[PDB]
Amino acid sequence: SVAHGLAWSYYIGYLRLILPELQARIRTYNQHYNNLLRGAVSQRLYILLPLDCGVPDNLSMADPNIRFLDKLPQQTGDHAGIKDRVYSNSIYELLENGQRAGTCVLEYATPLQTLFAMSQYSQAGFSREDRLEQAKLFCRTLEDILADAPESQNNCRLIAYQESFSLSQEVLRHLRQE
Amino acid sequence: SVAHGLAWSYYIGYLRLILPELQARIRTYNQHYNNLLRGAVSQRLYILLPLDCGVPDNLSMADPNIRFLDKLPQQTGDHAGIKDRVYSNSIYELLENGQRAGTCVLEYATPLQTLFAMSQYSQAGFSREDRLEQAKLFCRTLEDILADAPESQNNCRLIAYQESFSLSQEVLRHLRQE
Numbered sequence: 328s329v330a331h332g333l334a335w336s337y338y339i340g341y342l343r344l345i346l347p348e349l350q351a352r353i354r355t356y357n358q359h360y361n362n363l364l365r366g367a368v369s370q371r372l373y374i375l376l377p378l379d380c381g382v383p384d385n386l387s388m389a390d391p392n393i394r395f396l397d398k399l400p401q402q403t404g405d406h407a408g409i410k411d412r413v414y415s416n417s418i419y420e421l422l423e424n425g426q427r428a429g430t431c432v433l434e435y436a437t438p439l440q441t442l443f444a445m446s447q448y449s450q451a452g453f454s455r456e457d458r459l460e461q462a463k464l465f466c467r468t469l470e471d472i473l474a475d476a477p478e479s480q481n482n483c484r485l486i487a488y489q490e491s492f493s494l495s496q497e498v499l500r501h502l503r504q505e
Numbered sequence: 506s507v508a509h510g511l512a513w514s515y516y517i518g519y520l521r522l523i524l525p526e527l528q529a530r531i532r533t534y535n536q537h538y539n540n541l542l543r544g545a546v547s548q549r550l551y552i553l554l555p556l557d558c559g560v561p562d563n564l565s566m567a568d569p570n571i572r573f574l575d576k577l578p579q580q581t582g583d584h585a586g587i588k589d590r591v592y593s594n595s596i597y598e599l600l601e602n603g604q605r606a607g608t609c610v611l612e613y614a615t616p617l618q619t620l621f622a623m624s625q626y627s628q629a630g631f632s633r634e635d636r637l638e639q640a641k642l643f644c645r646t647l648e649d650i651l652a653d654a655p656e657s658q659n660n661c662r663l664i665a666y667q668e669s670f671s672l673s674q675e676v677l678r679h680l681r682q683e
């Protein structure tokens with residue numbers, strides 16, 4: 328299954344590698360690089376899962392209330408022959424009524440971009456209906472992996488959505504629960 | 506198909522992104538950072554495809570004649586909400602009879618590590634026989650993608666192998682053809 332392989336590669340090649348050290352990288356940022364007068368970055372990696380697989384490269388293009396602020400400390404390591412491969416994450420501010428209502432580590436799940444592009448390339452033999460069903464299967468498999476995964480211990484939140492709708496608000500709703 | 510999705514994600518999320526700018530990054534290295542007295546780095550990205558999916562993180566652990574030298578200039582760009590995500594590659598020297606017989610950009614195809622780990626995790630429902638058959642399907646799909654891909658224009662070489670056997674020699678054989 329396309330989505331089954333994609334869900335497992337996202338855990339094996341990314342989540343299980345960065346989640347153990349995520350809270351440490353955030354506490355490091357909150358103490359030494361975060362502006363002294365600002366709210367602390369929240370402790371979890373928030374992952375956006377648009378089921379229509381529309382994954383823009385700039386998050387501020389999906390909502391103007393979502394604005395880039397800073398990058399976490401970079402995590403590097405040797406991986407499949409690549410020396411010091413860089414895993415980077417970005418901190419965003421979420422604006423409500425124009426003012427900062429919260430800060431969090433936010434990104435899209437990249438494998439959804441793969442399902443999108445696969446639906447566009449003829450040689451992939453992958454229809455736009457395949458995409459919606461595989462997008463849902465990808466998220467189910469992922470939350471099933473992370474439930475049993477030892478690396479996910481209150482440090483990761485999946486935010487699936489389908490499109491009116493405000494992404495900045497959908498994130499803030501999860502953020503306000505904690 | 507697990508390998509079908511993995512082969513397409515490797516093209517969409519990596520090869521089609523780095524191959525257009527690979528030769529430019531190599532010429533930049535050969536002129537400004539390569540030691541003036543050394544042989545030029547070859548122009549292609551050589552990708553190792555062990556069908557047993559044994560992908561060590563340090564290439565020198567698979568063969569002592571393969572020694573790290575330097576990194577190419579890093580390629581950065583915004584991707585799925587990650588600002589300045591870093592794509593890095595490593596240059597290796599290949600020793601024959603103890604002396605440098607060639608230099609090239611070399612790495613393993615990371616999705617093979619995914620197939621390996623999937624075969625080890627019970628929740629993946631993926632047997633070691635599934636792995637060998639999916640490993641072969643992954644490479645077939647990949648070379649079929651790159652044949653028709655506009656980004657692959659004499660800048661990428663797939664080296665599939667199955668294990669005596671010397672990895673440094675198998676690479677040098679491809680290198681000596683050109």
Ligand SMILES: Nc1nc2c(ncn2[C@@H]2O[C@@H]3COP(=O)(O)O[C@H]4[C@@H](O)[C@H](n5cnc6c(N)ncnc65)O[C@@H]4COP(=O)(O)O[C@H]2[C@@H]3O)c(=O)[nH]1
Nearest residue numbers: 336337340341413414415437438514515518519592615616
């Ligand atoms: N050698 C090498 N291969 C790379 C690199 N980046 C991607 N690949 C490969 O391309 C394929 C698809 O790319 P994608 O981002 O869709 O999936 C990635 C992506 O969702 C997530 N991920 C991995 N590294 C990062 C990262 N640095 N930043 C954000 N997300 C990441 O986990 C998935 C699996 O990662 P893997 O690791 O196996 O790299 C393979 C991947 O199979 C790279 O920088 N170096």
